[PDB]
């Protein structure tokens, strides 16, 4: 029951042919997958971690400039030669100061002097990338057991190692049977166009070339402590008044200068092992050998009584928490359904078989009522505990919730949000392949426009789509126009 | 010269003290009795808690994280009057001189 | 600032986004607008940073 | 490019008074939390005192409790180190100290000065 | 105050060898209100005045080699050095800097061997 509270949480129900469920784990939702007869687990991806990844490019953030030296030449003979313009240490630029009787030439003209300034860089930033070999997710699983308190308990599941070298992981939980999973983490998240640059213990996940192409001195990327620099002229602001002479510069720290031009990426840990708390992964959990437990066990008789008033979270669910005040051996709690005394069965149990282990320690269930007036019996007999629920809502706007979510799955996703909680099937695949190509020629179309344009450029073809004609109207409006206003409104997270 | 300083922005900060309380769903706004001191930023916002952060009812509560603020080096920006510049004119006199 | 001195429009000065002082010399000096420099993450809804 | 010189250290027979001064350059001195730090010869650094960003919130430590003052002169840049009552065990070199920058503790040692060595003997 | 105690008072590498230090402290040096353990690492170069390499523990001071790492939490902390120079000789000093009365811990020394 580790899942119960997050409220972005999501249900995923059916069961293929044999017994495989597709789902798509994201950092801050866990899904729920029930089934038939198998105890409905609750997997959330818990932390994606990276060792032993090495550096390429490191870049420079603020200077210091010392032996500022200087040379001139007289006027119209030669040009200003300085024996440190070859060493690598020294940027400097030629300009043509005038020159007469005051300054001693021969005749009076133009003549160029240079200012070279040796660049001793401080504060790198590295940019680290990390390979495939080392990507290590970690997946979490908890059952709904019922168990005294594990409501919404973080640190009460079962832990299971996922890496690029052996990705068919097992998973074995204690008196319920082993689950396998066998997810790919090669499609999951990049990780090669993404490099981490780590400026005062801080760091985040940018695309390869946007990084690559930032106006700032760019190092080899060697470990040397002493590295030799390129392109030092963008932080050295040479200036020249009056043609007289010209001085150096250093032009600031530009550490946070550089603060929100990195703005729209994720951050990172980068505490020892570099925790990444972000991306996705995508599954198969082939649920065949993940047999429930107490099957056998029979039915209580005495009567149940509440601990904690019962309450509802975000997506429905009641968390009934009952104790069995009896005497009676292990047993399964029955559970009934009636609305308006006329006993129709309008509720599921989300937790597959609750049972309770131990007669002292309360048992705790998720149940999920009708929309309307409903009591729930829990006991046998005439005494048995009734729960009088009322969950307020309508199927229409359940069914709006769930077509909202799943935009959303989609437009963060993108082609992967099909293989979400999807058995393999024609249509899903056939709808894959489709979005794939349409994702690949948007994705190519757009691929670096904001917040605010996106909306823009969204009115404009949807106004483009209103008046027009031979079908382009319908296509252009619906399509772009929808989509596009849709992803300008969601599309910062 | 003798000009006076207007004000001074921030450039560097530094934050000390951060501090942070929530409650329940359908309960105010988290409180903290350091939001009404000039040296605080503090920012309310939301968080989803339930029975697993000992709370009954399941829903979005609130949090707010107070933080002290105090610059490091400021920058000023300072005025100029007209009682007290003063130009300076040199007027060199062609004497055909060595 | 830092030993550098440069003459900038007048509004232009007061329309930049820094957290502005009073100006005269005192102790703590009360800054205004300082959530320009303060970051308040939220760390996908669990805590905040 | 942070530049800590200090100066008042001599040499001086027991319980007289002495006042070390810790000129700084290389930051605006006003809006800092100064430090002061000492360690003798064979021994492990020890803590002395803190003098806050507002000039009213000094503290010291227990050793050297009720025996030390410590001020600061915003106008001159200079850290102040009135101490009295000095003993042959209190001498050492005396180092001052920077705040933390970047970080979170009020209280933390950025940068040291050069240090200077009092000598108290008779 | 807080006692400190750093697990080595002398440790003799050879060029090319990791070196690890253990300081532990006497009680908890993590501030509940923001979650972050408050601990500092000094190095004091023979004959000068000492730096700061390791600001909370985690996180790594300017202008400091990438080859020193602080790790540990919760009273027991822990440097290391991947690969040890010439210029790793000195007095490492361990400080808490929860509580105000500062404390450093005993020198510990590096020598290469």
């Known amino acids: 029951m580790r899942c119960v509270g997050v409220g972005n949480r999501d249900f995923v129900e059916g069961l293929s042919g044999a017994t495989w469920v597709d789902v798509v784990l994201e950092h801050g939702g866990c899904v729920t997958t029930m089934a038939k007869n198998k105890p409905t687990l609750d997997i959330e991806l818990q932390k994606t971690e990276a060792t032993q990844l090495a550096t390429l490019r490191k870049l420079c953030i603020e200077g210091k400039i010392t032996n500022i030296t200087t040379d001139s030449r007289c006027p119209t003979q030669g040009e200003a030669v300085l024996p440190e313009e070859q060493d690598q240490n020294y940027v400097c630029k030629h300009t043509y100061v005038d020159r007469g009787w005051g300054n001693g030439c021969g005749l009076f003209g133009k003549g160029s002097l240079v200012t070279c300034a040796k660049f001793q860089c401080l504060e790198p930033i590295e940019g680290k990338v990390v390979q495939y070999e080392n990507l290590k997710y970690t997946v979490i699983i908890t059952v709904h057991t019922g168990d005294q308190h594990q409501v919404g308990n973080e640190t009460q599941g079962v832990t299971a190692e996922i890496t690029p070298q052996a990705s068919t992981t097992e998973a074995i939980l204690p008196e319920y049977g082993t689950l396998g999973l066998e997810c790919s983490p090669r499609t999951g998240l990049d990780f090669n166009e993404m490099i981490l640059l780590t400026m005062k213990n801080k760091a985040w996940m940018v695309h390869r070339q946007w990084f690559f192409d930032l106006p700032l001195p760019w190092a080899s990327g060697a470990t040397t402590e002493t590295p030799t620099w390129n392109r030092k002229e963008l932080l050295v602001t040479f200036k020249n008044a009056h043609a007289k002479k010209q001085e150096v510069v250093v032009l600031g720290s530009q550490e946070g200068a550089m603060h929100t031009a990195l703005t729209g990426a994720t951050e990172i840990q980068n505490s020892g092992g570099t925790s990444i708390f972000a991306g996705h992964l995508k599954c198969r959990l082939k649920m065949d050998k993940l047999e429930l437990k107490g099957m056998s066990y029979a039915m209580c008789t005495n009567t149940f009584v509440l601990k904690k008033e019962v309450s509802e979270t975000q997506h429905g669910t009641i968390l009934i928490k009952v104790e069995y005040k009896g005497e009676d051996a292990p047993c399964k709690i029955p559970f009934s359904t009636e609305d308006g005394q006329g006993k129709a069965h309008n509720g599921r149990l989300i937790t597959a078989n609750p049972v309770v282990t131990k007669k002292e320690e309360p048992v705790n269930i998720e149940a999920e009522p009708p929309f309307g007036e409903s009591n729930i019996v829990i006991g046998i007999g005439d005494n048995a505990l009734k729960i009088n629920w009322y969950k307020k809502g309508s199927s229409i706007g359940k069914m709006f919730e769930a077509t909202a979510r799943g935009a959303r799955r989609m437009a963060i996703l993108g082609d992967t949000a099909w293989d979400f909680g999807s058995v393999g099937g024609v249509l899903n695949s056939l709808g894959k392949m489709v979005h794939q190509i349409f994702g690949s020629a948007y994705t190519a179309l757009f691929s670096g426009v904001s917040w605010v344009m996106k909306i823009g450029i969204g009115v404009l073809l949807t106004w483009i789509g209103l008046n027009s004609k031979n079908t382009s109207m319908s296509f252009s409006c619906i399509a772009i126009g929808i989509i596009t206003l849709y992803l300008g409104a969601v599309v910062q997270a | 010269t003798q000009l006076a300083t207007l004000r001074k922005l921030c450039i560097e900060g530094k934050i000390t003290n951060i501090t942070t309380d929530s409650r329940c769903p359908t309960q105010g706004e988290a409180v903290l009795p350091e939001e009404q001191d000039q040296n605080y930023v503090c920012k309310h916002t939301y968080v989803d808690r339930g029975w697993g952060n000992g709370c009954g009812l399941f829903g979005k509560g609130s949090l707010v994280t107070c933080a002290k603020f105090q610059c490091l080096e400021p920058i000023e920006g300072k005025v100029v009057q007209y009682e007290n510049l003063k130009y300076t004119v040199i007027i060199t006199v062609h004497t055909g001189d060595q | 600032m830092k030993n550098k001195a440069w003459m900038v429009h007048r509004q232009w000065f007061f329309d930049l986004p820094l957290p502005w002082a009073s100006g005269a010399t005192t102790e703590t000096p009360t800054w205004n607008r300082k959530e320009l420099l303060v970051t308040f993450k939220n760390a996908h809804a669990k805590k905040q940073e | 490019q942070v530049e800590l010189v200090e100066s008042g250290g001599d040499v001086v027979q027991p319980g007289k008074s002495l006042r070390l001064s810790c000129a700084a350059s290389?930051?605006?001195?006003?809006?800092?939390?100064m430090h002061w730090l000492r360690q003798a010869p064979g021994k492990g650094l020890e803590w002395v005192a803190v003098?806050?960003?507002?000039?009213?919130?000094?503290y010291y430590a227990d050793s050297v409790k009720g025996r030390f003052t410590i001020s600061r002169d915003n106008s001159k840049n200079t850290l102040y180190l009135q101490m009295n009552s000095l003993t042959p065990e209190d001498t050492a070199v005396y180092y001052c100290?920077?705040?933390?920058?970047?970080?979170?503790?009020?209280?933390?040692?950025?940068?040291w000065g050069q240090g200077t060595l009092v000598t108290v003997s008779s | 105050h807080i006692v400190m105690t750093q697990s080595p008072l002398s440790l003799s590498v050879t060029p090319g060898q990791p070196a690890s230090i253990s300081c532990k402290s006497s009680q908890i040096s993590s501030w509940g209100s923001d979650g972050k353990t408050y601990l500092y690492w000094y190095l004091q170069k023979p004959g000068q005045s000492p730096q700061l390499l390791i600001y909370?523990?985690?996180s790594r001071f300017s202008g400091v080699s990438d080859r020193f790492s602080g790790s540990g939490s919760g009273t027991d902390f822990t440097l290391k050095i991947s690969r040890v120079q010439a210029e790793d000789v000195g007095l490492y000093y361990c400080?808490?800097?929860?509580?105000?009365?500062?404390?450093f811990g005993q020198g510990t020394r590096l020598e290469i061997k």
């Open positions: 003098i806050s960003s507002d000039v009213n919130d000094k």
């Open positions: 400080m808490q800097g929860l509580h105000l009365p500062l404390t």
């Open positions: 100290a920077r705040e933390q920058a970047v970080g979170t503790n009020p209280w933390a040692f950025d940068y």
């Open positions: 290389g930051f605006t001195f006003t809006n800092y939390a």
């Open positions: 909370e523990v985690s």
